[PDB]
């Protein structure tokens, strides 16, 4: 059994709160490797499984996985309730997060004739506040994400109410020990794709990314460029331009995320601080969203 190490401190699977299978029940499901369920253990929960038709990497994969999400404690990271790893198929349980992913959430609730105030720059701004806090949370504990972006963050609910938090750790899982094709080089920093070079400030480079997910209201960055289009026009100094009524402050925020060299760009304490005064700020929060 692999080992894994966090903020110093070194776990096993033995670690790992196994919960009996038989206090597992499925409910329904909710593309990628392996099945995601509703269940209830009652304590609601979203279950992931490992197929059982899988190598032995794919295995040591999950279990690595298992390890990552169990040792965060931050009320920004998605809670892992327990595993079932010594029954088949594999499960680890994780905090029911309602609302789902960030970016079919953004997509899904965007403001329309229908839905005329769905969302506000406030919401966007506490979701932002929120991956941002989860972010700082990963950064002090010397964590590198890697793939900080939209589609692997989680809302705990729909309405007003709802907490944003980072929930995908794959990326990060894959280097700690696939292809070009599936890299998210729309979302890394120039030293990233080119050298291979990771950094606290690889994450803040993403981060600026994803704030142009949330303010443009789910849209794929860099429109109607390639990955190979994004490469050449990051590393000549190239940045997307505002989302659609995005306010000047927030815009700001994104271009500091993308600056060329990794020392000029901010923390997540400095980050905060700033989206902290844009919420502050009534020219930014009395904006209105586009309307599809
Ligand atoms: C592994 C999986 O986990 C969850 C998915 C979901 C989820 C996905 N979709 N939905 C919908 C269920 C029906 N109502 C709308 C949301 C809920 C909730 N909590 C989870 N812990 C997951 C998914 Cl599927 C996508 C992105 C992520 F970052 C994560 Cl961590």
Redesign the pocket.
Known sequence: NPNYCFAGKTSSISDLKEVPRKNITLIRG?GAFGE?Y?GQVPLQV?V?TLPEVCSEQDELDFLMEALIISKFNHQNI?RCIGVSLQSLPRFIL????????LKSFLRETRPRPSQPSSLAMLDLLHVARDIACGCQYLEENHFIHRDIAA????LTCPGPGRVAKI??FGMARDIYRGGCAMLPVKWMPPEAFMEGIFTSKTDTWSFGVLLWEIFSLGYMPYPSKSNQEVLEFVTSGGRMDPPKNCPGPVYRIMTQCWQHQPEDRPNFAIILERIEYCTQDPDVINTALPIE
């Open positions: 909710l995601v509703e979203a992931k998605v994780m905090e029911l997060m309602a609302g789902g992913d589609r692997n963050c989680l929930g995908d």
